[PDB]
Structures are given as C-alpha cells and as structure tokens.
Design an enzyme around this catalytic site. Structure first.
Site, PDB file in Angstrom:
ATOM      1  N   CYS A 108       5.120  -2.457  11.759  1.00  9.09           N
ATOM      2  CA  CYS A 108       5.468  -2.490  13.188  1.00  9.09           C
ATOM      3  C   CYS A 108       5.881  -3.882  13.648  1.00  9.09           C
ATOM      4  O   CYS A 108       5.070  -4.817  13.623  1.00  9.09           O
ATOM      5  CB  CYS A 108       4.267  -2.028  14.050  1.00  9.09           C
ATOM      6  SG  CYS A 108       4.576  -2.010  15.851  1.00  9.09           S
ATOM      7  N   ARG A 111       4.173  -5.659  17.266  1.00  8.05           N
ATOM      8  CA  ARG A 111       2.741  -5.968  17.355  1.00  8.05           C
ATOM      9  C   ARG A 111       2.291  -7.111  18.278  1.00  8.05           C
ATOM     10  O   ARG A 111       1.098  -7.272  18.529  1.00  8.05           O
ATOM     11  CB  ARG A 111       2.148  -6.137  15.958  1.00  8.05           C
ATOM     12  CG  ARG A 111       1.907  -4.813  15.236  1.00  8.05           C
ATOM     13  CD  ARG A 111       1.291  -5.046  13.848  1.00  8.05           C
ATOM     14  NE  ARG A 111       2.281  -5.519  12.884  1.00  8.05           N
ATOM     15  CZ  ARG A 111       1.978  -6.065  11.714  1.00  8.05           C
ATOM     16  NH1 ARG A 111       0.710  -6.194  11.352  1.00  8.05           N
ATOM     17  NH2 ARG A 111       2.947  -6.466  10.901  1.00  8.05           N
ATOM     18  N   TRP A 280       7.752   1.216  23.631  1.00  3.80           N
ATOM     19  CA  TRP A 280       9.135   1.339  24.063  1.00  3.80           C
ATOM     20  C   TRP A 280      10.067   1.103  22.862  1.00  3.80           C
ATOM     21  O   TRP A 280       9.623   0.639  21.806  1.00  3.80           O
ATOM     22  CB  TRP A 280       9.449   0.375  25.200  1.00  3.80           C
ATOM     23  CG  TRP A 280       9.078  -1.034  24.939  1.00  3.80           C
ATOM     24  CD1 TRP A 280       9.796  -1.959  24.223  1.00  3.80           C
ATOM     25  CD2 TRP A 280       7.913  -1.717  25.425  1.00  3.80           C
ATOM     26  NE1 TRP A 280       9.135  -3.166  24.220  1.00  3.80           N
ATOM     27  CE2 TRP A 280       7.977  -3.044  24.948  1.00  3.80           C
ATOM     28  CE3 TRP A 280       6.812  -1.326  26.211  1.00  3.80           C
ATOM     29  CZ2 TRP A 280       6.986  -3.991  25.239  1.00  3.80           C
ATOM     30  CZ3 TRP A 280       5.830  -2.259  26.496  1.00  3.80           C
ATOM     31  CH2 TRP A 280       5.924  -3.580  26.015  1.00  3.80           C
ATOM     32  N   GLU A 285      16.616   1.526  16.820  1.00  2.00           N
ATOM     33  CA  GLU A 285      16.036   2.807  16.429  1.00  2.00           C
ATOM     34  C   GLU A 285      16.979   3.941  16.845  1.00  2.00           C
ATOM     35  O   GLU A 285      17.198   4.903  16.101  1.00  2.00           O
ATOM     36  CB  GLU A 285      14.650   3.008  17.058  1.00  2.00           C
ATOM     37  CG  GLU A 285      13.633   1.900  16.751  1.00  2.00           C
ATOM     38  CD  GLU A 285      12.259   2.182  17.399  1.00  2.00           C
ATOM     39  OE1 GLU A 285      11.646   3.208  17.026  1.00  2.00           O
ATOM     40  OE2 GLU A 285      11.798   1.391  18.269  1.00  2.00           O
TER      41      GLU A 285
HETATM   42  C1  HEM Z   1       5.546  -1.559  22.663  1.00  2.00           C
HETATM   43  C2  HEM Z   1       6.693  -1.699  21.990  1.00  2.00           C
HETATM   44  C3  HEM Z   1       6.833  -1.347  20.490  1.00  2.00           C
HETATM   45  C4  HEM Z   1       7.935  -1.593  19.753  1.00  2.00           C
HETATM   46  C5  HEM Z   1       9.244  -2.266  20.229  1.00  2.00           C
HETATM   47  C6  HEM Z   1       7.689  -1.120  18.409  1.00  2.00           C
HETATM   48  C7  HEM Z   1       8.576  -1.189  17.370  1.00  2.00           C
HETATM   49  C8  HEM Z   1       8.446  -0.522  16.173  1.00  2.00           C
HETATM   50  C9  HEM Z   1       9.519  -0.179  15.259  1.00  2.00           C
HETATM   51  C10 HEM Z   1      11.022  -0.483  15.447  1.00  2.00           C
HETATM   52  C11 HEM Z   1       8.984   0.428  14.206  1.00  2.00           C
HETATM   53  C12 HEM Z   1       9.768   0.968  12.997  1.00  2.00           C
HETATM   54  C13 HEM Z   1       9.664   2.487  13.081  1.00  2.00           C
HETATM   55  C14 HEM Z   1      10.863   3.106  12.442  1.00  2.00           C
HETATM   56  O1  HEM Z   1      11.895   2.397  12.305  1.00  2.00           O
HETATM   57  O2  HEM Z   1      10.776   4.306  12.086  1.00  2.00           O
HETATM   58  C15 HEM Z   1       7.551   0.524  14.412  1.00  2.00           C
HETATM   59  C16 HEM Z   1       6.639   1.083  13.541  1.00  2.00           C
HETATM   60  C17 HEM Z   1       5.324   1.366  13.813  1.00  2.00           C
HETATM   61  N1  HEM Z   1       4.671   1.106  15.009  1.00  2.00           N
HETATM   62 FE1  HEM Z   1       5.441  -0.014  16.581  1.00  2.00          FE
HETATM   63  N2  HEM Z   1       6.410  -0.584  18.354  1.00  2.00           N
HETATM   64  C18 HEM Z   1       5.850  -0.687  19.621  1.00  2.00           C
HETATM   65  C19 HEM Z   1       4.589  -0.225  19.962  1.00  2.00           C
HETATM   66  C20 HEM Z   1       3.679   0.388  19.126  1.00  2.00           C
HETATM   67  C21 HEM Z   1       2.412   0.989  19.518  1.00  2.00           C
HETATM   68  C22 HEM Z   1       1.869   1.087  20.970  1.00  2.00           C
HETATM   69  C23 HEM Z   1       1.821   1.462  18.407  1.00  2.00           C
HETATM   70  C24 HEM Z   1       0.444   2.168  18.265  1.00  2.00           C
HETATM   71  C25 HEM Z   1      -0.580   2.035  19.131  1.00  2.00           C
HETATM   72  C26 HEM Z   1       2.696   1.157  17.278  1.00  2.00           C
HETATM   73  C27 HEM Z   1       2.436   1.445  15.954  1.00  2.00           C
HETATM   74  C28 HEM Z   1       3.342   1.532  14.940  1.00  2.00           C
HETATM   75  C29 HEM Z   1       3.068   2.099  13.637  1.00  2.00           C
HETATM   76  C30 HEM Z   1       1.736   2.699  13.112  1.00  2.00           C
HETATM   77  C31 HEM Z   1       4.394   1.971  12.883  1.00  2.00           C
HETATM   78  C32 HEM Z   1       4.694   2.418  11.436  1.00  2.00           C
HETATM   79  C33 HEM Z   1       5.281   3.823  11.569  1.00  2.00           C
HETATM   80  C34 HEM Z   1       5.451   4.478  10.234  1.00  2.00           C
HETATM   81  O3  HEM Z   1       4.898   3.969   9.204  1.00  2.00           O
HETATM   82  O4  HEM Z   1       6.145   5.533  10.203  1.00  2.00           O
HETATM   83  N3  HEM Z   1       3.806   0.512  17.754  1.00  2.00           N
HETATM   84  N4  HEM Z   1       7.266  -0.081  15.617  1.00  2.00           N
HETATM   85  N1  LIG Z   2       9.293   1.850  19.277  1.00  3.25           N
HETATM   86  C1  LIG Z   2       8.468   2.447  18.363  1.00  3.25           C
HETATM   87  C2  LIG Z   2       7.080   2.260  18.382  1.00  3.25           C
HETATM   88  C3  LIG Z   2       6.264   2.861  17.431  1.00  3.25           C
HETATM   89  C4  LIG Z   2       6.852   3.681  16.479  1.00  3.25           C
HETATM   90  C5  LIG Z   2       6.084   4.322  15.505  1.00  3.25           C
HETATM   91  C6  LIG Z   2       6.709   5.140  14.557  1.00  3.25           C
HETATM   92  C7  LIG Z   2       8.094   5.319  14.584  1.00  3.25           C
HETATM   93  C8  LIG Z   2       8.852   6.208  13.619  1.00  3.25           C
HETATM   94  N2  LIG Z   2       8.257   6.328  12.286  1.00  3.25           N
HETATM   95  C9  LIG Z   2       9.333   6.830  11.413  1.00  3.25           C
HETATM   96  C10 LIG Z   2       8.842   7.902  10.461  1.00  3.25           C
HETATM   97  C11 LIG Z   2      10.023   8.698   9.930  1.00  3.25           C
HETATM   98  C12 LIG Z   2       9.724   9.105   8.509  1.00  3.25           C
HETATM   99  C13 LIG Z   2      10.600   9.949   7.836  1.00  3.25           C
HETATM  100  C14 LIG Z   2      10.293  10.301   6.528  1.00  3.25           C
HETATM  101  C15 LIG Z   2       9.129   9.802   5.940  1.00  3.25           C
HETATM  102  N3  LIG Z   2       8.298   8.983   6.611  1.00  3.25           N
HETATM  103  C16 LIG Z   2       8.575   8.629   7.875  1.00  3.25           C
HETATM  104  C17 LIG Z   2       8.843   4.679  15.562  1.00  3.25           C
HETATM  105  C18 LIG Z   2       8.231   3.857  16.497  1.00  3.25           C
HETATM  106  N4  LIG Z   2       9.003   3.245  17.421  1.00  3.25           N
END
Ligand code: HEM
Ligand SMILES: Nc1ccc2ccc(CNCCCc3cccnc3)cc2n1
Ligand code: HEM
Ligand SMILES: Nc1ccc2ccc(CNCCCc3cccnc3)cc2n1
Ligand SMILES: C[C@H](O)[C@H](O)[C@H]1CNc2nc(N)[nH]c(=O)c2N1
Ligand SMILES: C[C@H](O)[C@H](O)[C@H]1CNc2nc(N)[nH]c(=O)c2N1
Ligand SMILES: [Zn+2]
Lengths: 411, 407
Positions: A108, A111, A280, A285
C-alpha cells in the site's frame, strides 16, 4: 541483524531492524525469489502466543508494558481462551489492530494516512440486513460528499469457520460485467463471475456499461442476501478531459469510493473475514488499470483513434501517449468535482517521506516494490529508485478464498 | 518444488522445473524478500567444471558418451595438474551464449542463441586489448545494423593477473563537476572521468564527450586509448513533430556495450568480457535522459512544450517523458540504427518465455528489471508472474578496478 536499503537517486541509506519482528513467510527461499507472484478453525493451542504477542505490542505502544493493566489483561485473555477457545478484543485493541494492519500493508503506497482511520465496530451485527445498515453508514461517512475519509467496518470474528460473516463483493461499490453470446463483454470484465452470481440470486440487471452491483451479504455462515445500495449514496464522477471535448463523449464515469470488501483482517490470532475498508483513489488505479488493462474496459484503442495518433506501429508510442491523456482526464474530472484523489507523483513522494519516518521511528517499513511502483511512468516517481524490504508483520490484511468456492449452501 | 507462473491478463499458466537446477543464492529468505535490492581452488573448481560439462554434453546429445567421459577426465587431470583448465572453443561459445540466456534481468534474451563470440584469450597487452575492442565495436555496429557480440579476454589466474576494462560501457559520455556546483555531461560517469584525467586524459570538457578506453592487461596498470571516432556511431535526437527539439542539442551513441561485468563458465572467471546488443528505447529516453541523477532534462523539455508545471497532477512530466521517448525512437529509426521499443521487446520476451518454459522447463526472470521504466502495465510483462533464480554460466557484477588495483 541489521539490513540496509539504498535510494539510488539520493544516495540515502536506511537501516532495517523491524524485519526481526517478522513471523509469517514470504514465498521466497535462498534459492528462489517469488516477489512478483500475485498470491504466494484455529486451536487454543496456537492462539495464546498470538494473543500475547499482539497485547505486548499494544501495551508497548501505549507505554504500559509490564503494567498491572498489561498483566491482568494477559491473564483475562488466557482464561477466556481456555474457557471459550477464543477471546474478545477491547475497543481500543480493535482500533489499534485495524490501524496497524494498514500500517503493515507492504503493498500500500497510501500508508502515510494509516493513523487517521475511522474504525466502525460492527461486532454486535447478527444478520445481513444488519450488515447492510452498517455498510450504508460506512459509505455515507467515508464519502462525505467527496471529501473522502478513510474508514473500516469490522464485523464479528470467525469462530468455527462455519459461521463466517462475509461480504461477497470484492469492493463495496463496483460495476457489473456481462458476457455476451458473441464473446464480447459489456461493463467491467473483472466482475463477470460475480455479476452472474447476483443475477442467479435474483438481481435484475439493467445490463449497461456502468451498473452499480448489488451488495451480496453473508451473516453468521448463512446463505448471502442481496441489497441495493441507495443510489443517493453512490458518488460517481463523469470523466472529461480539460482540453479534449470529445472525451466526455466516450461515455466514461467512475465511482469515487474505493472500498475493498473481500480481505481478511488478522489481529492477535483473531480472524475478521468481513472487514470492508475504504480510502481514496490514486489516479492510476482507474486511468491505467481499470480503463486501460486489456482485460478491463480496455479503452486505449478508442481513445487513440479519437486523438488521431499513428496506430500502425507501436514505436509511435501511441499507447503511451493515449494512456497519459486518460490519466489526465481522470485527475481533472475528480478535482473538478471536488472528490478526493491523489496523482501517482504526489502519492509516491509522500510514501518516501512516510517510509523514511517509519525507519527512524519504527526501525523499518516493509514495502512491496512490485506493488508500490505505479503502473505508468515508473522511474520518474521516486519509489522506482528506492530499495525496499518486503516482510510480513501482524496485525495484517490477508487474502481469502472467494466465498462461493467454499460456502456451504443452506438452501 | 514444481512451480507455476500465471499471466493475469491471459490466464496462461506455465510450470517451472528449471529452477530445481539453481545453484547460486538470491539474497531472499522465507522471512524477507530482497527482490528490489540492486546487488544482494582445485576442490571448488572440478564440481563446477563437471556441472558445466555435463550440461554442455547433454545439449549436444552425448551425455554419458566416451567423448563426454574423456573430456571430464581430461579437465579433471588438468585441474589436478595446473590448478585451472582451459575451455574448448565449443565450450566457450556455449558458455557465453548460456550466460546471456540465464541473465534473469535481460528482456532481450529471445536473441540469445545469435551471439558472435570473439575469442580474445591469446591477448597479452592493453594495446592488444584495444585492437580487439575496436574490432568488436566495428563488427557489432555494422553501419547501424547492429549484431550482438561478446569479446572474451584471458580468464583469471591468481587474481593478480586480471584483465579488466575499467569503463562500465565501451562507449559512454564524460562527467565533469563544475565550480558552478552543477554537473556537466553524464553525472554517472563523473568519478571515472576523473580517473581518466588522473591517468592523463585531456578532456574536451564538453557535454557529450566519448570517454577514452582504460584497459588493464595481465594485472598491469591500465592504459588510455581513444576509440577511432569513425567507429563510434552516434544519433542526433530530433522530434518528428517538435522543431525546437533539435535545439536541445541532445545525442546518444548507438552501441550499448557493457564492459564491467564478470563472465563465469564452468568455474572459470572472465573478468574482462565486454558484450553488446542494441538499445531498447526507454534505456535512453527514460533512464539516461530523465533520471534525476542523470541528464535530467524533463523540466527543460516540459518548458519548451509549455505545459502547466505548477501542479504534479497535470501529469506534465508524464507527457514530456512520452515525447522524449518518441524522439529517441524516431531518431534511431530515421538514421537506420537498430533500436527496439518497449512494447515490441516485452512482447518478444513473452514469446521467449513461452519457448523456454516449453523447451527448457522455465526461464529465470527478474520482474523488477524486465518491466520497462515507463508505461509498465500496458506491456505484457507487467501481468506476467516470474520466478527469479540464478543459473550458471552467468554474468556477475564485480568491484570497480580502482577500489582493488594494487598499482
Ligand atoms: C487513503 C488513501 C489510500 C490510497 C491512495 C491507497 C493506495 C493504494 C494503492 C494504489 C494500492 C494498490 C492496489 C492495487 O493497485 O490493486 C493499495 C493497496 C493496498 N492498500 Fe491502500 N490506499 C489508501 C488507503 C488504504 C486503507 C484505508 C487501507 C486499509 C485500512 C489500505 C490497505 C491496503 C491494502 C491491504 C493493500 C494491498 C491490497 C492487495 O494486496 O490486494 N489502503 N493502496
Ligand atoms: N485506493 C486504494 C486503497 C486500498 C486498496 C486496497 C486494495 C486494492 C485492490 N487490490 C487489487 C486486488 C486485485 C487482484 C486480482 C487478482 C489477484 N489478486 C488481487 C485497491 C486499493 N485502492
Ligand atoms: C540484443 C538486444 C538486447 C536488448 C534489447 C537488451 C535489453 C536489456 C535491458 C533493457 C536490460 C535492463 C538493463 C538496464 O536497464 O540497465 C538488460 C540487462 C542485461 N542484459 Fe540484455 N539486451 C540485449 C542484448 C544482450 C546481450 C548480447 C547480452 C550478453 C551477452 C545481454 C546481457 C544482459 C545482462 C547480464 C543484463 C543485466 C545486467 C545488470 O544486471 O546490470 N543483453 N538488457
Ligand atoms: N540493451 C542492453 C543490453 C544489455 C545491457 C546490459 C547491461 C545494461 C546496464 N547495466 C546497468 C547497471 C546499472 C548499475 C548501477 C549501479 C550499480 N549497479 C548497476 C544495459 C544493457 N542494455
Ligand atoms: C504478476 C504481477 O505481480 C502482477 O501483475 C502485479 C504487479 N504489480 C501490481 N501492482 C499493483 N499496485 N497492483 C497490481 O494489481 C499489480 N499486479
Ligand atoms: C531500487 C530498484 O531496484 C532500482 O531502481 C532498479 C529497479 N529496476 C531497474 N530496472 C532496470 N531495467 N534497470 C535498472 O537500473 C533498475 N533499477
Ligand atoms: Zn524474494
């Protein structure tokens, strides 16, 4: 053991000691790196040390480590575990755990915001209707008319794995995907399987390109139920380009609130299988992945035609040229409608500062380079040049199997 | 122990068996991935020799032949006697091609079997080395129709008789530090550019000065040599739409010829083994031109385009980056110097990956390096799961000679 990471753009060197507190495995061995692999019922036996480790962390964080309050709490939890085979977190612990799960989320980039997270305790919930109400409140609070606020709603923890609460949607708000007999897909191809389930469960599909999917909610191990989120609560943004007037005519829009609903939150051995959270969007994305992935809305061709780029050879970089304008449009549209969004430059820069702060105050910041680097313009962001260490801390957000693969249907 | 990789754009899954043959270590553990970290005797020698010869002899369908066995015995005798051994020409070629084939960070490996190998093991002096390099440069450049090649100087003996090319690439631009505080030329080459001057080079102190060769033979002190200018093919950089672009006064050389790596084959170490192929456009346009610690031209280019550089969210950097990369590709193509775009090259690599999995049981790949530094997810490699591991023969990094040279 100390570990050094180097930024090769600034020559900054950082020292990781935090990885020492790491339990969970990576997938990697000394003979193989699995760093680009996407995805690489618990006895009282293993439960107390996990409880203990968490509670030790928590009491250190509040500067009460070794206090009578600390000790009595350990004692209280130990007994409740041998009496009941599980335990309940205090509100303070649940909040601390939820925040730290986010803080430990190595994939993420967002963070820096981890300490500001609204925690909604939904552990008194018993039914799908109950879950719906909670979720609606989450969406309204988090949406805040465009001034987005990070929130998480936490439903009851797993018990025997036979009474799980689950949200079947991968995201609280997402567009339907429909497979047509001609092999083409209408709407979001990523959501086809789930759309079919909803339809099969009674959903009447409008069958358009941007139909907001119904919530499919499972409480206490029961069969899931369908609920429609009130439209008035679903904030959406029409996409236009600041210079290109034909861009609105592409017919694009997106929803304001990214709200991931299919992950599992682990706190001190406890498993929260229903824990939707929202922040947000980073602009890419939507502008890069949702719109431009071949397996998604796949709009690069149509955009590139309208821009009249040379599409006969890839070496014109017509794809790169169009990808940029789309991302410009996404950012412009959101800002124009005053809906929170961050560009990939701002978000990566903020992350570097966050990461540096985490090294100083915490002794580390685990980070997954493969996920942290944006899907466009990689090396002109400062994270590309940042060495990162990836390891797994608890509390944590984990993947879990899609519920329709595991659910025992009551009928 | 039998590993599968998935492409998430196509759902295609490949099974990896090849990784079981892995020998060297990654730097990763079950507790920590270091995937993003840039750089994580007689009894030692014969197993290495045997492992190599086993695979060499398996590749030509004579595993367990007398000619196999005989060779094993010959090399084994020779190690006992000489404490080292010499490679047959056939083995030297197989080894070099396979080092490239095993380069987990190279997106261009589809070309791996087409490598011109120049045996330069008879070389004894720096002038000698210079002659070999000029020959290499001219062959590879081929008037702009680039051909891949490697030139191999004598193997290490006792580490005090090393052959070394001090340059990081055969062809590169000098870096000078100004009293003005800024940096003139290529900042990545500042230190080397000093050492040149320290050894007697007369710098023209320009922005695009082709550096002299600094060649070390048989452990001796290094000597300077000027590559004949007629052999250094360069490309002036113009945009096919923006007239003012030529006024930026940028150029680049056509021949990427990495000269500082260490080639290891059957336990033998080739510390001087310059090799060359041709550029992928992003290497110059994204990294060389737009990295902050490099020529860093984004701001200047953006200005000339009159973009709103007030806020990051206009994506002006992104816009410029594209245009800059368009120009690099356009220039090289217009002049008919070989170049590949990141789209064409990554697509090629997916094909190569398929071939390697099908015919060899897998293909070690470092996703962090394979994914181009721009437009990542609009290339197929982004959606491709990869297993990174270390096979031998290999190209390895090695310390800069000045930090090691007993003068
Ligand atoms: C507040 C603004 C936030 C932004 C801009 C942001 C941004 C991102 C982005 C761009 C990703 C990549 C996900 C993807 O490309 O599929 C991500 C992953 C992730 N985010 Fe954040 N995030 C935010 C808030 C949060 C919050 C509030 C949480 C949880 C309480 C969180 C937890 C996670 C987790 C667990 C992942 C990994 C997802 C995965 O492994 O599929 N994020 N974040
Ligand atoms: N802006 C944000 C904030 C938090 C987010 C958390 C998770 C994600 C999307 N996770 C992508 C998972 C898609 C996938 C597909 C196949 C196998 N594994 C995962 C976006 C967030 N954006
Ligand atoms: C012919 C076309 C070729 C193309 C398009 C190509 C492309 C690339 C690219 C883009 C990189 C990333 C390196 C960087 O960004 O600095 C790379 C790395 C590498 N290439 Fe290739 N290459 C080609 C030929 C060759 C040849 C002929 C060899 C050796 C015989 C080779 C061996 C390597 C090695 C060892 C690396 C990793 C080196 C390091 O870690 O610094 N390549 N290549
Ligand atoms: N087109 C090609 C072909 C082969 C190549 C081989 C190597 C390289 C560049 N090596 C980059 C090393 C950068 C570095 C900096 C500091 C410390 N360690 C490594 C390009 C090629 N291009
Ligand atoms: C195979 C590879 O791990 C996969 O495409 C990853 C790469 N990096 C990513 N990074 C982010 N932020 N989101 C993703 O979905 C992915 N996908
Ligand atoms: C920190 C990170 O490892 C570093 O920036 C890497 C990332 N990927 C790269 N990829 C290529 N092709 N070349 C590079 O120099 C780098 N640098
Ligand atoms: Zn790893």
């Amino acid at each position: 053991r100390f570990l050094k990471v180097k930024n090769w753009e600034t020559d900054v060197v950082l020292t990781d000691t935090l990885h020492l507190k790491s339990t969970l495995e990576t997938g990697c061995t000394e003979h193989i790196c699995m760093g680009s692999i996407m995805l690489p019922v618990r006895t009282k036996d293993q439960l107390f040390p996990l409880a203990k480790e968490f509670l030790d962390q928590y009491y250190s964080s509040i500067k009460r480590f070794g206090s009578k309050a600390h000790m009595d709490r350990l004692e209280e939890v130990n007994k409740e575990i041998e009496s009941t085979s599980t335990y309940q977190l205090k509100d303070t612990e649940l909040i601390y755990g939820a925040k730290h799960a986010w803080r430990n989320a190595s994939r993420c980039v967002g963070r820096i915001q981890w300490s500001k997270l609204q925690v909604f305790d939904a552990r008194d919930c018993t039914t799908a209707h109950g879950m719906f109400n909670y979720i609606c409140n989450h969406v309204k609070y988090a949406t805040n008319k465009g001034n987005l606020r990070s929130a998480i709603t936490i439903f009851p923890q797993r018990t025997d794995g036979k009474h799980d609460f689950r949200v079947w949607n991968s995201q609280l708000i997402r567009y339907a995907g429909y497979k047509q007999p001609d092999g083409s897909t209408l709407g979001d191809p990523a959501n086809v399987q789930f759309t079919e389930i909803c339809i099969q469960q009674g959903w009447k599909a409008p069958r358009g390109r941007f139909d907001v999917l119904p919530l499919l909610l499972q409480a206490n191990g029961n069969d899931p139920e369908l609920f429609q989120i009130p439209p008035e609560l679903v904030l959406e943004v029409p996409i236009r380009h600041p210079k290109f007037d034909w861009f609105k005519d592409l017919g694009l829009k997106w929803y304001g609130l990214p709200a991931v609903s299919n992950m599992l939150l682990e706190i001190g051995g406890l498993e929260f299988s229903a824990c939707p959270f929202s922040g947000w969007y980073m602009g890419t994305e939507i502008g890069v992945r949702d719109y431009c992935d071949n397996s998604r809305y796949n709009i690069l061709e149509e955009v590139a035609k309208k821009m009249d780029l040379d599409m006969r050879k890839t070496s014109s970089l017509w794809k790169d040229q169009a990808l940029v304008e789309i991302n410009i449009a996404v950012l412009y549209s959101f800002q124009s409608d005053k809906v929170t969004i961050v560009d990939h430059h701002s978000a990566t820069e903020s992350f570097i500062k966050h990461m540096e702060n985490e090294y100083r105050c915490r002794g580390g910041c685990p980070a997954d380079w493969v996920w942290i680097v944006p899907p466009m313009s990689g090396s002109i962001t400062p994270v590309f040049h940042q060495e990162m260490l990836n390891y797994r801390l608890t509390p944590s957000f984990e993947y879990q199997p899609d519920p329709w693969n595991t659910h025992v249907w009551k009928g």
